[PDB]
Design a protein around this ligand. Structure first.
Ligand SMILES: [Ca+2]
Ligand SMILES: [Ca+2]
Ligand SMILES: [Mn+2]
Ligand SMILES: [Mn+2]
Lengths: 341, 341
């Protein structure tokens, strides 16, 4: 059932072509220490992973990033802003997989081009001084850009996946694990726990070879609450339960809450009301360390097959516009100010 | 968080060392056609995937196989027997991963040895004329033995995993997809559906390189019902629902039922009573095509750290002994005889 084996250019080559720049190196090094301390509760700033549902237009991503970088100096005493740079969209069965799989959006499937532009985008963003977030999807793609990532995620669909826990245990970035699509938080706690251990597993090298990897474990793992079939899990009730589950596993990292996806129930205009509940919580407890917001230049979404596409509007999930995103940052920064004694 | 990159020997080399023998080739070719026809309903024999929970002793596996091969001629008009040769055990967080990860059972993690003995075991079994089943776990291990596999599985924990659906879409073996650990059958139906499509995805070659794979899709995918947090799903009620879900996705393959794991609720002495319900169903409907039984030489299980280990007894999940397995085959063969007009 194999039509064709096609050539893949190893990460080595793209790393030579698109080197780790000094500003990038320093942004990652610094922001990684900063998010680790927030995750463990040693800083009471709140982390905000904010950006487009998925990248389809790198030029639009740069323009978005410019606007975001402008806000950082307003909020940096209260908030750590990390830009969401996602290259894959989950699909129930089929559909556009994302920018890495098909960057030209035309079923040409130019994965080499995808990987090249993905890395180049991450190089550009971090070189502007913006920390970046992405989902770690498999054992091949991360070698192309994992050293440009400050914070990463394991998705709801792979939270029970053994190689994903193993993979996370070897990544340098801090890692959040989403609860299951059905709403189960225990499996995400299990995943965090597993990821703290050393593992031997099969992965790939920068030279494009297969290899055995012995990992050290990742002590900066935490749960992301993102709703599911059980219903939204952003409330105080749900956060306390998650914390209780973590303590049972002897894990002391804090909780991140996704304002979007299952918690907003896919409604982009609900993100701000989920955030309002989270801010009230942030004021009276240090249990929540972070949130995720799905945000873009133009609000809402469109069909990927529309000609011409609206510039700066999501081609996947509905996002809030930037104006609304600034209000949300204001809300979070106030939450932190009131939190502080 | 990487302690060490260690060398992995590419499948190429193990394939040269442990070649596909002629009897093996013919067993796989024939048995694959046979299971495909059963899955699609064109044969009304029932497929039986039967064997140890997981392999830890290849010599004990050969002895088991000999006994199994002896039964085939008794039952082959009614039943297609496929031997279960599993090399991995799911763990909530940590524990012995299985024979590939750590064949010497001592945290030496000699994965190359594991892969070598795994392939050599599969070569031996198929060379005896026994079709074999295994779980397809990742994008690296299958290159070492996928051409010796008649029927494969995607586990409950990876049923929502995108690369696993993609992987299945490129494998030649027939593939069953387990329902989710929570009990959700829809996700397994979704996975079967997705696996019928062509995909472009990142995988690995026999030379041990990374590559893009364009697949054709796999039209021999089906659901495996195996219980979960929802409770056992072996009953008629549950089988009808699964069939209804499949028809909605325009998938016409039939249903396999695991007598063990979630359906027996981990109790090995319940497998036979779950099977009794399934046989009654098999008599009056062609919806169920297959079952899974966890079986070994000695009944029950033991701790992997016992010195000395009991020969022929499971080191993971509890299995029924062979005597009881023969009774179960008798029951299934009778079920089919009554089914037939
Ligand atoms: Ca402790
Ligand atoms: Ca049709
Ligand atoms: Mn999204
Ligand atoms: Mn088992």
């Amino acid at each position: 059932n194999i039509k064709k084996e096609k050539v893949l250019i190893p990460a080595e080559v793209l790393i030579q072509d698109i080197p780790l720049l000094k500003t990038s190196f320093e942004t990652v090094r610094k922001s990684r220490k900063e998010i680790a301390n927030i995750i463990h509760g040693n800083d009471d700033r709140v982390a905000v992973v904010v950006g487009p549902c998925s990248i389809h237009d790198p030029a639009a991503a740069i323009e978005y990033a410019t606007k975001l970088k402008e806000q950082v100096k307003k909020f940096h005493k209260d908030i750590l802003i990390i830009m969401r740079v996602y290259f894959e969209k989950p699909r129930t069965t089929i559909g556009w997989k994302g920018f890495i799989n098909d960057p030209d959006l035309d079923n040409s499937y130019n994965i080499n081009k995808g990987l090249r532009l993905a890395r180049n985008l991450l190089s550009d963003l971090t070189n502007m001084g913006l920390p970046c977030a992405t989902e770690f999807l498999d054992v091949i793609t991360p070698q192309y850009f994992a050293e440009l990532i400050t914070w990463g995620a394991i998705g709801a669909r792979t939270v029970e996946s053994q190689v994903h826990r193993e993979l996370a245990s070897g990544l340098s970035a801090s890692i959040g694990f989403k609860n299951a699509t059905n709403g189960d938080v225990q499996v995400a706690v299990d995943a965090v726990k597993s990821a703290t251990y050393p593992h031997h597993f099969l992965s790939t090298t920068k030279s494009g070879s297969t290899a055995i990897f012995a990992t050290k474990g990742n002590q900066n793992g935490h749960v992301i609450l993102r709703g599911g079939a059980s219903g939204p899990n952003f409330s105080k009730e749900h956060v306390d339960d998650c914390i209780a589950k973590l303590k049972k596993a002897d894990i002391n990292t804090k909780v991140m809450i996704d304002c979007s996806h299952g918690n907003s129930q896919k409604d982009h205009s609900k993100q701000i009301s989920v955030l309002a509940d989270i801010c009230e919580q942030i004021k009276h407890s240090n249990d929540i360390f972070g949130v995720m917001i799905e945000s873009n230049l133009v609000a809402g979404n469109q069909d990927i097959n529309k000609k011409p596409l609206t510039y700066g509007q999501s081609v996947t999930d509905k996002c809030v516009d930037f104006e609304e995103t600034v209000k949300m940052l204001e809300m979070l920064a106030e939450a932190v100010q009131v939190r502080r004694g």
